[PDB]
């Protein structure tokens, strides 16, 4: 196969080329994107366990040089709050928005969505909100007012790079 | 250009310079994170047809040894149902919900999304839902009960990559 | 430490492994994808600034031969249009949606949210709106019928890499 770093006319810039090779298999991995030093962004399909608490996401280990970064984006969402289990990525369970008495009774209606996260010691503390419309929910509770506090109705996907 | 390998003292790892060449070019390529082995995420742009079924999406080819993965997150969205087109990344057309009239009407409030995806025979199988308010849908069909099925007013952006 | 070219019976494609080193390290990188050439998808976290306009987000620099892509995907909303700042990745202000006297009253519901991009000279143009339930909005303004425009209440992830 063997490998070699041509030049190109089109510009004034170098290449290495490896393309005659399959696969290229490396350990850690980092790269320039206009003039700031990447790694690759990974991904991870995440979910809130019951209870109404931040969700706790290890931060990956980082070349020497670079800062831990996150961004947490929506998948798919409703206004269930706790009642729902969204942790499969080929079906979800949505069972309707908290009533006065307890009871489960339709899916309210949504204002928002915000999703939260900051680093603490090598760890991401991911935490989300559903706004709703007012006048459903129970009084008090991790599903209250018109909020649902770190719902299980939510599935996000995190992504994790480092950077300079 | 050359190229060679370098090591740092600030900790006990060592390094393969090639930030000499302003491009490496590689063909398959893959590296770890935290022990686990990936391939790159790779993004493209989707929205489903219209009659209210299932978009599929080709798999990508993994290197020996990994499983495709998948993640689909939301980008555009509206109550619109069929009504839409939102195929371009530039303009949307969203014309409102079908009454129970099968008239276009102003669209209805929301409620939740759902993106689901199977790994079926290297072929990704995505569906979705929007859920809205009750009483505006007609009974039957794609966009009925409170119910957007595998909508026209949606576009996600679908994740692959290959990990162990 | 050093370096090879290795070979798996396992189907038949050649390997350069490179997972004797702690850390590959490059400058720029391309590699294939079911026979397209990209670059790594790079992200940002991105709000729109004061006053309903356009959010300009300068181009990354592509190898020779690719050109530049863009996605934007959905991380926090609200409802509250200019009455907020999400520029914050650890947490958010909403005060509410503006009201026909131009006072901040409660969040009103959705009806959706469109995000779109167009690359003009090396730059991307990204535009947003929400759509809210009528008879809320005063009758002009950035926030004005039933829309959101360019909304503060909004955080996206900007994801660009490059292709051919």
């Given at each position: ?29 980092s790269?320039?994107s206009?003039?700031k030093t990447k790694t690759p962004v990974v991904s ?13 996401i290890?931060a990956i280990?980082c070349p020497?040089?670079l800062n831990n970064r996150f961004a947490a ?44 996260w900051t680093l603490?010691?090598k760890?991401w ?33 995190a992504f994790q790079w480092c950077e300079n």
């Open positions: 196969s063997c490998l070699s770093v041509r030049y190109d006319t089109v510009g004034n810039k170098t290449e290495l080329d490896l393309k005659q090779i399959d696969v290229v298999s490396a350990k850690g991995l790269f320039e206009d003039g991870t399909y995440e979910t809130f366990q019951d209870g109404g608490r931040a969700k706790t290890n280990e020497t040089g984006v929506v998948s798919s969402f409703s206004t269930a709050g706790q009642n729902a289990n969204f942790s499969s990525e080929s079906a979800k369970d949505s069972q309707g928005t908290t009533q006065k008495d307890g009871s489960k009774g339709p899916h309210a209606l949504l204002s928002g969505i915000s999703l939260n603490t010691n760890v503390d991911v935490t989300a909100s559903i706004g709703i419309e007012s006048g459903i929910l129970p009084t008090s509770g991790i599903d209250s007012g018109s909020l649902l506090r770190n719902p299980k109705s939510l599935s996000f996907i």
